[PDB]
Design a protein around this ligand. Structure first.
Ligand SMILES: Cc1cc2nc3c(=O)[nH]c(=O)nc-3n(C[C@H](O)[C@H](O)[C@H](O)COP(=O)(O)OP(=O)(O)OC[C@H]3O[C@@H](n4cnc5c(N)ncnc54)[C@H](O)[C@@H]3O)c2cc1C
Length: 458
């Protein structure tokens, strides 16, 4: 229960576990949505706390899986959290950063701090569901989750997997009047109930031996492309609206032009709300066509990616591809591939295709491949791999290791679109790739200045 007139739509919250309410603080286990503003999970947690006459507290688990990615993501995330600590303290909301995996750490925190209720935010990824299961086994209090990431709650937008954007889109657009709304201000707590610097230090030390390097031993990653944190995210949204949105409709498929929003690292870590971004873009007057194109990406393609992972347990595997695509890829499984590259050759940009290699260099060096070349890139991994299953493994591996926005439903769904035709149609049949949409080198040369892209990332 929340207080009357809390302005919380109950369809954004789902019970994970019934239990017996304790009498201590409401705990928001923050995971996907690392921000203090425009955060329905935090707002709901604050409202339940108010109704129960207790403070709200935030807990965040620094998990054992950080060593599966790189310094690039750890630093981006932790520097954000350092800023988040301050923002929350200004609301008199304490934040606790627990070192370990959530099953053990959240269970013990709930016991030690006498939590009344546990709330988390929503992710459809397997790792979050693994963590939920272990937490559920270790707690006796009620446990809710709130969809703070999507404008329309994932379980409301559709009751099933949607095979196409054109079947998801009408369902989603029909629910915006309900769910696309301004956010209330977060009410501070009535009174105030190892540093992150130390953690960051220790973690970087553990990641240093796996850092991506040039043959010169100097690191590949350039950390000045995306300043982390909630405040920077807002400035990137504002600069997009002011300077790039007008040209987005025309230039979003031109990787030589910096005309995308550059919001994905912030959106992935939840340092900015996609609902906020949509409210601000909807209010803007910009060139015809651009707003439509952008909203189709951040509403339909982003939220269909959560739809994909939520309703397909096997979202990272061949089995989740549509039937037409499985049958087509199977029919061509024994076709001789034109090339076969090792994961190390792909990783180092050592194929015979200079556009592919430049796309990989953009990823290595900036942590954000242009969205047009991500499609080209993944499709060539299919073409130059022993099987579609190996192609998925390679693409996921590289995406998750080197993208700042990786380890994300958008990535699994984008790789499945690219390799498996998920949310696509069948195209003309070719050897190796069957009826999966093909993106040729020469087609790219007709579309944009390939030589300039290669020079930029060489
Ligand atoms: C093989 C492949 C891998 C991808 N990997 C990721 C990934 O790891 N993480 C990730 O967040 N996105 C991924 N994408 C989707 C897309 O490429 C990026 O979201 C986009 O490039 C992000 O840059 P931006 O924020 O400047 O994009 P913008 O074009 O300005 O769009 C803004 C937001 O809309 C969303 N969006 C845009 N395009 C897509 C899309 N095709 N699918 C889903 N959402 C979209 C994103 O949240 C994006 O940040 C991938 C796509 C493909 C084909």
């Amino acid at each position: 229960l929340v207080p009357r007139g809390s302005h919380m739509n109950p369809k954004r919250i789902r019970a994970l576990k019934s239990g017996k309410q304790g009498d201590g603080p409401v705990v928001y286990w923050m995971s996907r949505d690392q921000r203090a503003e425009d955060n329905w999970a935090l707002l709901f947690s604050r409202a339940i706390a108010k109704e129960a006459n207790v403070p709200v507290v935030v807990v965040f688990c620094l998990t054992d899986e950080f060593l599966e990615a790189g310094i690039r993501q750890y630093e981006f995330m932790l520097k954000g959290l350092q800023e988040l600590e301050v923002s929350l303290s200004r609301k008199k909301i304490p934040s606790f950063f627990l070192r370990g995996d959530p099953g053990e750490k959240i269970s013990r925190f709930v016991k030690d701090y006498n939590a009344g209720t546990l709330v988390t935010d929503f992710s459809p990824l397997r790792i979050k569901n693994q963590w939920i299961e272990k937490v559920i086994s270790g707690i006796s209090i009620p446990f809710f989750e709130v969809d703070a990431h999507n404008v329309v709650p994932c379980w409301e937008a559709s009751q099933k997997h949607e095979y196409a954007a054109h079947t998801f889109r009408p369902k989603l657009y029909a629910l915006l009047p309900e769910f696309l709304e301004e956010f209330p201000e977060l009410e501070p707590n009535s009174v105030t109930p190892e540093t992150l610097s130390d953690v960051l230090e220790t973690g970087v030390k553990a990641l240093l031996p796996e850092r991506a390097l040039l043959k010169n031993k100097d690191p590949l990653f350039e950390p000045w492309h995306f300043e982390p944190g909630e405040k920077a995210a807002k400035k990137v949204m504002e600069s997009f609206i002011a300077d790039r949105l007008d040209s987005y409709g025309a230039l979003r498929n031109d990787p030589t032009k910096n005309m995308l929003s550059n919001l994905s690292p912030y959106l992935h870590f939840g340092q900015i709300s996609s609902q906020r971004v949509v409210l601000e873009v909807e209010k803007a007057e910009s060139n015809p066509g651009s707003k439509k194109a952008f909203l189709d990406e951040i509403l339909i393609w982003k939220e269909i990616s959560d739809n994909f992972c939520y309703y397909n347990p096997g979202y990272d595997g061949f089995e989740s591809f549509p039937s037409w695509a499985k049958e087509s890829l199977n029919a061509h499984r024994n076709d001789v591939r034109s090339h076969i590259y090792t994961l190390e050759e792909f990783e180092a940009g050592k194929t015979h295709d200079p556009l592919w290699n430049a796309s990989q260099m953009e990823l290595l060096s900036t942590g954000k491949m242009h969205g047009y070349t991500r499609m080209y890139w993944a499709k060539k991994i299919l073409e130059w791999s022993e099987s579609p299953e190996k192609a998925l493994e390679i693409a996921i591996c590289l995406n998750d290791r080197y993208e700042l926005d990786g380890r994300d439903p958008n990535g699994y769904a984008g790789i499945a679109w690219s390799i498996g035709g998920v949310h696509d149609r069948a195209w003309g049949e070719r050897e190796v790739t069957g009826k999966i949409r093909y993106m040729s080198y020469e087609g790219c040369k007709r579309k944009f200045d390939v030589k300039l892209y290669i020079e930029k990332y060489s």
